[PDB]
């Protein structure tokens, strides 16, 4: 496919929140023994425009990809409050290490584990709003809201 832009995304968050899984769900749209996908690409369509997305689970060239990041998916696990409590630390890196146009989107992953919910939708939304973040709850496992996660960022990126 004949893209016209390249948006670089980072994905960041505590270990085990589902970053690789989110990346794989988005880039393959579908192996516990594996380390887990680190990097991926996908040509999406956003406002009648074809854009190549580069997506990197980042946890020299790394610093240069950071500085050129159009978007940043900041991920927590809704079943583990500690991953939510670490969000201000990730946001500091996400802001400090990228550039002034970088669109940050908060993702509350593992939403399918509803019986294990440890963080409310509401408190997380208030954090997002306070910090000017887009915010979705998602499930990398089922695929619920995973495209929207990547596509919502991309639409806001395109407006600049």
Binding-site residues from annotation for GDP: 16-21, 109-110, 112, 140-141
Q: Which residue, 13 or 71, is less far from ligand GDP as judged by CB?
A: 13
Q: Which of 83, 98, 139, 145 binds ligand GDP (CB under 6 A)?
A: 139
Q: Which residue, 143 or 158, is less far from Ca ion as judged by CB?
A: 143
Which residues fall within 8 angstroms of residue 89, CB to CB, at 6 or more apart? none
Helix (H) / strand (E) element for 70: namely strand 69-77
Residue 115 binds to ligand GDP (criterion: CB under 6 A): no
Answer whether 135's CB lies under 8 Å from 128's CB.
yes
- The DSSP output letter for 114 is G
Residue 102 binds to ligand GDP (criterion: CB under 6 A): no
Residue 18 binds to ligand GDP (criterion: CB under 6 A): yes
Smallest distance, ligand GDP to C-beta of residue 13, A: 6
The torsion defined by the Cα of 100, 157, 71 and 23, in degrees rounded to 10, comes to 180
Residue 19 binds to ligand GDP (criterion: CB under 6 A): yes
In the annotated binding site for Mg(2+), the residues are: 20, 34, 57
Answer whether 139's CB lies under 8 Å from 111's CB.
yes
Residue 143 binds to ligand GDP (criterion: CB under 6 A): no
């Amino acid at each position: 496919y004949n893209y016209s832009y390249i948006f670089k995304y980072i994905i960041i968050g505590d270990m085990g929140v589902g970053k690789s899984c989110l990346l794989h769900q988005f880039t393959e749209k579908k192996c516990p023994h594996t380390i887990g996908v680190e990097f991926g690409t996908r040509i999406i369509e956003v406002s009648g425009q074809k854009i190549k997305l580069q997506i990197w689970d980042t946890a020299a060239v790394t610093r240069s990809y950071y500085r050129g990041a159009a978007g940043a998916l900041m991920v927590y696990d809704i079943t583990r409050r500690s991953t939510y409590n670490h969000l201000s630390s990730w946001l500091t890196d996400a802001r400090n290490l990228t550039n002034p146009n970088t669109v940050i989107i908060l993702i509350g992953n593992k939403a399918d584990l509803e019986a294990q919910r440890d963080v409310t939708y509401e408190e997380a939304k208030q954090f997002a709003e306070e910090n000017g973040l887009l915010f979705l709850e998602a499930s990398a496992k089922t695929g619920e809201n995973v495209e929207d996660a990547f596509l919502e960022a991309a639409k806001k990126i395109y407006q600049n």
